[PDB]
């Protein structure tokens, strides 16, 4: 039909091919009837039978709406001229053409777009073979015709099927896409048609999973937000956990989401086509800096039931990502560093009662000088992430409990082994998954209390020695810069009773430590250079 447009127009001077004939006759210096265009075009015809509409009936129905139509220029199986070529030959009649104008290929593109149902699979090479056969047949009928080809144009259809009478108008957010981290957070991207996004406001609408027609949530973002030529809107975990809480009983990961964008400009709304597909996972595009925090259930508390204020249980279970301490860590880190909150992703690595050498889960094996089982298990999951790890946070080691339980004068040997294992581990992690200049950040030590409040201190000297070793390591420039001490940890308030055993921290202590760690990580601050007033004092010598 793209060639048929030149003929289908009405009136004498206004038609397309009249300009063609007038130009050719004027240039050659002959009268108007020198050139005689012939119409052989047929609307919506495919060169290949398989790509054709309804390739089951060979009856010719050019007008359609009367039945199945047989519309193919050529059939590769059992080479026959085909009905459309016969129509062209009939329209020629008894004439000798000197040139041929050829333009076709919209129906082939449509067939390639949606090829599922058709038994012969549409392909490019079959279209090439069909076109070559058509050209050879036409040149077989008439000896040496030169052939001119017209390039394919673009076809757009209608944006939204609900409103048939809306054309493509200015300010249309056409290119829609979305992606998510390993964390639950999601980002939206769109690209405007005519209007520059700066002088506009956009509204995102998200539809109900149960009733795809209804709408759950909608928020307005300014048009100034642009990154890499794309307009963006950040839909973080803290925003979509409450929505899922209202929609369903428990928080669930969100996939297969349907959404739209409506541009607001001069008191006008220009919606876009809906987008409905499974959200792809891409850490490399989204997140910039990755934080691996904690080992040994004291840094692992930043992701579990300990830090959750609204969760009743305390048996080390997974907590809601909205209210857990890692969220505050990420928010402080992003706010101080200047990045967007979606660009920072914390990652959980932990094991039960793990330690460098002492614990039942050994992170390093000194006998063979090779990473322990815990690091081996962690390695595959860490390498799974596309982005390179940036910060490793070392929680309170498990050596304190073992030292207080079954050691009296063995402590210096444990300190030397701990330092050697930490240095070897740092070198190995720097080498294996790359990202040199990786630094292991530290966290304060833990004491043990036992009694009715106020309780009785245990192993104060062990924690003093461990903290002294940590400060000594942080002061040196080998690495192991110390993030922060727990703000309490000496006044027995930042601990939980748990039937008269005060080993672990409380919610508020976890949040305070998270804020301190975030401020320390975002801006390079080694707090070992400025220890607090305490930790200078030592236990009284003799009782």
């Amino acid at each position: 039909s793209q060639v048929a447009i030149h003929f289908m127009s009405g009136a004498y001077p206004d038609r397309g091919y009249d300009v063609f004939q007038k130009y050719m006759t004027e240039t050659w210096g002959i009268n108007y009837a020198g050139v005689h265009p012939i119409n052989g075009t047929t609307g919506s015809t495919a060169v290949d039978r398989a790509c054709a509409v309804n390739p089951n009936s060979e009856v010719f129905d050019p007008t359609q709406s009367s039945g199945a139509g047989g519309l193919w220029w050529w059939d590769l199986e059992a080479d026959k001229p085909g009905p459309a070529l016969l129509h062209c030959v009939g329209q020629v009649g008894k004439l000798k053409p000197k040139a041929i104008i050829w333009g076709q290929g919209d129906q082939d593109a449509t067939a390639l777009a949606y090829p599922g149902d058709r038994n012969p699979a549409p392909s490019l090479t079959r279209t090439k073979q069909a076109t070559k056969k058509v050209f050879e047949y036409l040149r077989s009928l008439y000896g040496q015709i030169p052939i001119f080809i017209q390039e394919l144009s673009y076809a757009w259809g209608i944006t939204n099927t609900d409103a048939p009478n809306v054309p493509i108008r200015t300010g249309l957010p056409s290119f829609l896409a979305a992606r998510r981290n390993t964390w639950g957070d999601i980002e939206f991207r769109w690209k405007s048609y005519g209007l520059d996004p700066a002088l506009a406001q956009y509204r995102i609408e998200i539809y109900n999973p149960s009733n795809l027609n209804q709408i759950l949530h909608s928020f307005v973002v300014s048009g100034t937000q642009e990154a890499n030529g794309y307009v963006y809107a950040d839909f973080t975990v803290e925003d979509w956990i409450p929505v899922m809480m209202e929609a369903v009983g428990s928080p669930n990961p969100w996939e297969f989401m349907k959404w739209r964008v409506v541009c607001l400009y001069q008191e006008r709304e220009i919606p876009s086509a809906p987008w409905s597909d499974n959200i792809p996972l891409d850490n490399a595009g989204l997140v910039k800096k990755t934080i691996l925090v904690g080992i040994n259930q004291f840094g692992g508390g930043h992701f579990t039931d300990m830090s959750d204020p609204t969760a009743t249980t305390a048996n080390g279970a997974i907590g809601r990502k909205d209210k857990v301490s890692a969220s505050t860590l990420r928010l402080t880190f992003a706010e101080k560093a200047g990045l967007r909150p979606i660009q920072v992703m914390p990652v959980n690595v932990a094991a039960d009662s793990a330690g460098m050498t002492v614990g039942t889960h050994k992170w390093w094996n000194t006998s063979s000088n090779s990473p322990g089982d815990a690091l081996l298990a962690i390695n595959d999951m860490v390498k799974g992430l596309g982005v390179k790890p940036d910060y490793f946070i070392e929680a309170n080691p498990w050596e304190t409990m073992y030292m207080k339980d079954v050691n009296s004068s063995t402590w210096p040997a444990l300190m030397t082994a701990f330092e050697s294992s930490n240095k070897a581990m740092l070198a190995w992690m720097r080498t294996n998954w790359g990202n040199p200049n990786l630094e292991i950040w530290f966290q304060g030590a833990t004491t043990v209390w036992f009694g009715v409040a106020p309780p009785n201190d245990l192993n104060s000297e062990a924690t003093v020695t461990v903290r002294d070793k940590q400060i000594q390591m942080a002061t040196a420039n080998i690495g192991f810069k110390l993030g922060s001490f727990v703000p309490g940890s000496n006044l027995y308030t930042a601990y939980r009773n748990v039937e008269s055993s005060w080993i672990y921290y409380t919610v508020e202590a976890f949040h305070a430590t998270a804020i301190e760690l975030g401020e320390a990580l975002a801006l390079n601050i080694n707090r070992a250079t400025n220890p607090p007033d305490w930790s200078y004092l030592r236990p009284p010598a003799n009782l």
Binding site: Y23, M24, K132, F148, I149, E151, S153, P167
Partner: protein, 104 residues
């Protein structure tokens, strides 16, 4: 911002059309006496005519005239001068109508 404005909206059929353009270029390069008539990748949705139901799939009148001019220019480029020649090369006054018996 000019970085975010796009001349044409997204359509699922754009990639196959580019592939078909490439395959037609291959046919042109690998066949005898085949040429390029006109280039229609320039025209944008403002040019096409909207229709209820399906919309923006056919050219306007003005774009049809422009494409016809391009085709005429290309055909003239291939054949600059009028090839055909006529046995009668003068006006009717010059010729003298005579009758003869059979030749020889």
């Amino acid at each position: 911002s000019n970085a975010a404005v796009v001349p044409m909206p997204y359509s699922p059929t754009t990639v196959p059309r580019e592939q078909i353009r490439e395959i037609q270029l291959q046919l042109i390069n690998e066949m005898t006496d085949v040429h390029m008539g006109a280039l229609t990748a320039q025209y944008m949705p403002d040019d096409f005519t909207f229709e209820p139901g399906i919309g923006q799939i056919h050219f306007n009148v003005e774009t049809s005239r422009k494409v016809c001019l391009d085709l005429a220019k290309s055909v003239l480029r291939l054949v600059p001068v009028y090839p055909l020649v006529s046995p009668v090369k003068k006006q009717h006054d010059d010729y003298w109508f005579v009758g003869r018996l059979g030749l020889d």
